[PDB]
Design a protein around this nucleic acid. Sequence first.
RNA 1: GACGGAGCCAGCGAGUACAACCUUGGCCGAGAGGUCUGGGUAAUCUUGUGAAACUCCGUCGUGCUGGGGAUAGAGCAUUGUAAUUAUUGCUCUUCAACGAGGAAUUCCUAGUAAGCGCAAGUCAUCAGCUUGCGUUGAUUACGUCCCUGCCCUUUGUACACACC
RNA 2: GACGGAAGGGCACCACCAGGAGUGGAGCCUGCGGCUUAAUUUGACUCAACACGGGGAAACUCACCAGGUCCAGACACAAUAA
Lengths: 176, 53, 141, 119, 145, 96, 106
Amino acid sequence: AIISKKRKLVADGVFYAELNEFFTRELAEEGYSGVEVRVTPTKTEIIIRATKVQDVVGENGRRINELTLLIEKRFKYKRGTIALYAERVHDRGLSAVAQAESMKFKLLNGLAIRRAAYGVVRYVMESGAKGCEVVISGKLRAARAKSMKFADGFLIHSGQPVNDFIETATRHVLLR
Amino acid sequence: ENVWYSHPRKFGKGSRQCRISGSHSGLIRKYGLNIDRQSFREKANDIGFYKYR
Amino acid sequence: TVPSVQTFGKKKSATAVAHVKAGKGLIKVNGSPITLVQPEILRFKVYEPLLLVGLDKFANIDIRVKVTGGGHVSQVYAIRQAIAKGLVAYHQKFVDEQSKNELKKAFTSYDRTLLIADSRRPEPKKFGGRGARSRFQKSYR
Amino acid sequence: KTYSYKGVDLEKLLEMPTEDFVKLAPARVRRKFARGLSEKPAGLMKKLRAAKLSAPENEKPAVVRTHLRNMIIVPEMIGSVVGVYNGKVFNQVEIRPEMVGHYLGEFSITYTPVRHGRA
Amino acid sequence: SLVVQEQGSFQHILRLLNTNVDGNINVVYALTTIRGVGRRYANLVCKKADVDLHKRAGELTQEELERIVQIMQNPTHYKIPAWFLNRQKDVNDGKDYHSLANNLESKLRDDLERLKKIRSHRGIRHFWGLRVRGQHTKTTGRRRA
Amino acid sequence: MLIPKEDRKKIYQHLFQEGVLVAKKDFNQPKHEEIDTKNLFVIKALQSLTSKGFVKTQFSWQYYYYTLTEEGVVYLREYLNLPEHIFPATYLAGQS
Amino acid sequence: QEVVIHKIRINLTSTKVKQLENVSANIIKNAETFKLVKKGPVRLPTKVLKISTRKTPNGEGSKTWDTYEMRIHKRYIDLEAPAHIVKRITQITIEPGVDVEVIIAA
RNA sequence: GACGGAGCCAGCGAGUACAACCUUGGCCGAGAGGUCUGGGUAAUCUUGUGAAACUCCGUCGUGCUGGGGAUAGAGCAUUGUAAUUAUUGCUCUUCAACGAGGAAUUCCUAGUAAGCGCAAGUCAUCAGCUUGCGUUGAUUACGUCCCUGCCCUUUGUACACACC
RNA sequence: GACGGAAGGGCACCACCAGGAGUGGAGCCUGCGGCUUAAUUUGACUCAACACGGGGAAACUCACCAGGUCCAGACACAAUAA
Ligand SMILES: [Mg+2]
Ligand SMILES: [Mg+2]
Ligand SMILES: [Mg+2]
Ligand SMILES: [Mg+2]
Ligand SMILES: [Mg+2]
Ligand SMILES: [Mg+2]
Ligand SMILES: [Mg+2]
Ligand SMILES: [Mg+2]
Ligand SMILES: [Mg+2]
Ligand SMILES: [Mg+2]
């Protein structure tokens, strides 16, 4: 890059954000959770988290390779300098993004909203965390739009007991 | 193809352009981000800026 | 070489640093005497510790103060503080505990910082107001 | 009373080189002249010349309509019917003295200049 | 510094360059009362003349006054270039002039007339009675004529 | 959109070689990276290709994310004739 | 076989402090084991990257400001050490977040 | 107080690549700003940001007067393909309203109020703006519910679009 | 529950006392509203609109007005068609 250290770091952050956004857009059915960017002077490593690993892979190594190629194209990288590693989250019922995606999928298939929310909460409980809440805003098969709360256990709201101890995901569902 | 379709778009709002939506209003160019404010708000925690003070 | 004590002085953000040595009778601000400092009125503020302790307690001293930051008044205050602190440090090192006590007593008939560094540091200027506490101007209608 | 443009008299400037005029002009005008010359007023001057030619010589030429309010005239024009664009309307302007080196936009007032109050 | 008391020699209130010059203002600042004459340039003129500034208005002997007047009216010869005088470059002669008293206003009037004749924006504004140099009349200029 | 045919062919060839296409929503601009053509045309071509299946599309951060399915690849090959066993990068070559 | 002393600066850059600390510790350990001349991990003025932004996406409402900040940690090390082996050393051990940069000069 | 000199002291920043940044030092110009050079893609160089306000020696001296600098002219640069409807800047001249502000009402209880700058955001060029620093640093409370709200408790409601 | 020109008990310098500092006065500056205009694009109207939309816009911006181009109408099927 040759650019200033601070600026470089900022750029890296931006790139990470971009990558995350891309993954959210593309890997819906592939069940995406989170990304990490590890940089060694010769090789750039990206560790992707998902629930349906085979899909992410493709066939032998179809989709991951294409994603790598895309990445290379986007931010100008020579073929081979970048790499991808798709790996499981050991507890799927802790990463908020994954939960959100699941909820979205449940919604798009044609399920009742309330029931879906309850199912998600149950799943979270089974996974094992100190409580969770679901907020569903908008139309609940009505012309007038409302808010929902699906709470179990107990929550925190203020402090550094927020960060690390909490995971927050906002995901919007488009419908008829 | 036209050699009459574009005049100079060198600065101000031309080259000084968004890197998310394609807007022009509210462009934080600090540290060469080129992100819109609103978008930045919902993303800055991933880029690495926080609410410390 | 003769042992010598380093001290400092703080006010707002102004930093003085005094170097107290054994010598003839030096008292110096940057490269000048205390007979100058700057504002002519506040010459007594920096001179005050000397007046308090006794000028004879300087007949074997060398003092040099490097001062950076603040404005002018703050700088002066810092210098004064450093000088006081320098003296006390010297006493701690070379002289006697009773002497130190005496010095402290002399100072604490005022306690304009001198031996103890000041608190009271700038408060951050918040949004929706020109000042730290000062809010903007409510218009209504 | 006749006219002096910038020291140099009326008659000599109706057919006079541009560079000399630039030299004997305000600094802004000089700067303008310096910055861009080739394919910048396209062929406005040419058009003006053509108009002059087509006229009976004793009469003022046919109206040449320009969107250029930005244009500063050179003394090779003068007595030329330049219709200046005011967003919608073409304004007729005739030049004799030193409006030379002055922007054509100054003589076509853009906003319709007020009625207001009636009190 | 002057210990000199001075007897009845200085006559206050002087009629110089038609416009009345008042008493005991500090030479430079006595000259400023005349239109076209302004502070710094008055001072410069005084310096050129070689009269000490720390003197009274009535103090000035006639010769000195004459010299000052000469300096004012014919400025170019006494080492006063361009970044100096009133009508630099000018539109009528090519030479620069330091216009004074009852000249500058006349020049301005002439300019206005010319603008009116040639229907320029500034001229139009002047005719109207409106603000010219980049001002928003949403608030500006409610004093009227 | 009507693209000069040779240019279109070139674009297609490039795509086949890659298995990946970018071109941002930066319209009007002189030239795209890698492929030496005007971007708008390229984008239109890509969209056309997508319309019947074939390619994938994401609009994220104004980038466009073009990758082909195997059927799509086959179709592309047919369009540009090209003999058997010429590979994009979907067919694995390296080691990771 | 080379054996030539470089006199080299190594700069680190990190948004995360803990990772940086770990890296520094690792470097110190390496220095200890190979017995090399060093200047002990030198801190810098940490650049705080402040982006002052109105929280409101529309503007209609009260004047609320948020300064989204990123404190960036530098921390550098100076090594007066040999060649190939030193190079090998100054490549291994990577924590997620921290960036290691080794310059040149012989 | 203003106007001259001359003392001299700050903290946040921010700043170059696949472009045209912050700019030092030496000569031009009386300013702005040019110009050959280098330093600096960062605790290093700009920058100790030698910042103002202040500090000392003067000059002026109760005067809409050297207080005020709006409005006007005219000219020299700069940014930009493009400055007219002064972009801004600098030199000039032009010197109005304005003698501490009615009823009204905002803000503030200690490094705070105010004065004073600076940097950043916007930015090609422009700050009277915001956002953050830092200099200078007071006066008066440490309380009450009278006005303006708020909190709970009781109370009365012919009010729940809930006293609008 | 709200509300009370109800009662107790507490609070607050967007409440007041004891005081600052002013604005409201003057000119300018910017933003409104109102009028005008081809257009003066708009959204805000008690704090919780009015130096607010990061809104210090010469083109850009951009929305407005006057004009002039351009297809960025995928794809499907019909017709045209060397
Ligand atoms: Mg709690
Ligand atoms: Mg708390
Ligand atoms: Mg003055
Ligand atoms: Mg003043
Ligand atoms: Mg400093
Ligand atoms: Mg006066
Ligand atoms: Mg402007
Ligand atoms: Mg009622
Ligand atoms: Mg409130
Ligand atoms: Mg603004």
